[PDB]
């Protein structure tokens, strides 16, 4: 039974409850996460920017079952196009506004990837993404505004791709950890 969650705090019990078996019910999932209404000073101590690009700060380990964290973007800040390693990803607007652009997967052939659509991430939206789906960039494109996003990947993973849009060849890179529970990890 989904109740509005009322604190970060807890829509993470809640989301404990939602990840407690094998399964991922993703409209419930998502609906939870939209429910909370964003409350800046709940995650403040998450939200760690770095000058130079998006940072990744671990908000909650899961129990194993997810990895919870909030992602900082600077103004110009984006990611790469990328995958999901097989997992579920949940993408809520904690502050501001990013551009999710999406791509299918390239085929073998080396082509110039094109964007399928893009839309624009609005405060308190929460969206969803796995590899079935398709390939995404996310990217904050303001000039003025900082965005902040919480993201929810189950299973956890450490690893993805991206993908060169030139040529849609991918490279592993491994996620790196700004801070974790609130605690900078250089
Ligand atoms: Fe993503």
């Known amino acids: 039974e989904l109740l509005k969650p009322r604190t970060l705090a807890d829509l993470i019990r809640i989301l404990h409850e939602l990840f407690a ?9 998502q609906a939870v996460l939209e429910a909370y209404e964003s409350n800046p000073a709940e995650w403040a101590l998450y939200a ?23 992602l900082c973007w600077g103004e110009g800040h984006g990611s790469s196009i990328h995958d ?9 607007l904690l502050q501001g506004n990013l551009k ?10 080396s082509n110039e990837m094109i964007k399928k659509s893009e839309r624009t991430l609005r405060e308190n939206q929460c969206a969803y993404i796995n590899d079935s789906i ?3 960039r996310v990217e904050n494109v303001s000039h003025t505004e900082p965005a902040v996003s919480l993201h929810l990947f189950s299973p956890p993973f450490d690893t993805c791709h991206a993908f ?10 491994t996620m ?6 609130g605690i900078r990890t250089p």
Do not use: A
């Open 176 to 181: 790196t950890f700004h801070s974790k529970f």
């Open 164 to 173: 060169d849009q030139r040529t849609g060849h991918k490279n592993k890179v």
């Open 134 to 136: 398709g390939l995404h």
């Open 21 to 29: 078996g094998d399964e991922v019910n993703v409209e419930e999932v």
């Open 48 to 70: 760690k920017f770095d000058q130079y690009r998006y940072t990744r700060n671990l908000v909650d380990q899961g129990n194993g079952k997810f990895n919870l964290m909030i």
């Open 100 to 109: 999710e652009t999406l791509f299918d997967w390239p085929d073998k052939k």
């Open 84 to 92: 999901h390693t097989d997992s579920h990803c949940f993408l809520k």
